[PDB]
From Swiss-Prot:
GO terms for biological process: regulation of defense response to virus. Overexpression of this protein to provide quantities adequate for medical use as a topical microbiocide has been attempted in a number of systems including E.coli, Lactobacillus jensenii, the yeast Pichia pastoris and Nicotiana tabacum; see PubMed:20162270 for a review. Keywords: Antiviral protein, Disulfide bond, Lectin. Belongs to the cyanovirin-N family. This is Cyanovirin-N.
Length: 101
C-alpha cells in the first residue's frame, strides 16, 4: 500500500498540498498534486489518517526524509509539539497520478 516514493522523485510539500513527479505505467513522467487535508486528522498532538482539517491546528508543515511529513501540532494543552506521519502508508502512485488508498 502506498510507497509512491519508489517511482516518484523531487517530491515537495507546501502547506497541506503534496506535489511530486511520478512515472507513468507506459513510461513518461506525470506531475500532479492532491490535498492531504481530506485524509489527515490531529489527535491530541499527533497526525492520524482521518479527515478533520489538521492544518487548521498545525503549522510549519515540511517534507522530511524521502516519505515522512514533519509538522508541529497543538495538543489539548494548547502547546505545539513535534509530530510526524508516514506518507507511504496510503499515498500510492497509480499510472503517474497520486491517489489515496
Ligand atoms: O516499483 C514497482 C511498482 O509496482 C506496482 O505498480 C505497477 C503499476 O500498477 C503502476 O501503474 C506502474 C507505474 O506507473 O508500475 C508498476 O508496473 C506497485 O506495487 C507500485 O507501488 C510499485 O512502485
Ligand atoms: O477544528 C476542529 C479540530 O478538532 C480536533 O482537535 C480538538 C483538540 O484536540 C485541540 O486541542 C483543539 C485546539 O487546540 O481543538 C479541538 O477541540 C482535531 O481534529 C483538529 O485537527 C481540528 O482542527
Amino acid at each position: 500500500l502506498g510507497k509512491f516514493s519508489q517511482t516518484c522523485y523531487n517530491s515537495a510539500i507546501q502547506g497541506s498540498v503534496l506535489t511530486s513527479t511520478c512515472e507513468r505505467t507506459n513510461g513518461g513522467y506525470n506531475t500532479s498534486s492532491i490535498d492531504l487535508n481530506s485524509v489527515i486528522e490531529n489527535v491530541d498532538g499527533s497526525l492520524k489518517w482521518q479527515p478533520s482539517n489538521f492544518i487548521e491546528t498545525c503549522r510549519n508543515t515540511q517534507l522530511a526524509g524521502s516519505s515522512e511529513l514533519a509538522a508541529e501540532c497543538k495538543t489539548r494543552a494548547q502547546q505545539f509539539v513535534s509530530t510526524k506521519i508516514n506518507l507511504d502508508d496510503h499515498i500510492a502512485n497509480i499510472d503517474g497520478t497520486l491517489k489515496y488508498e
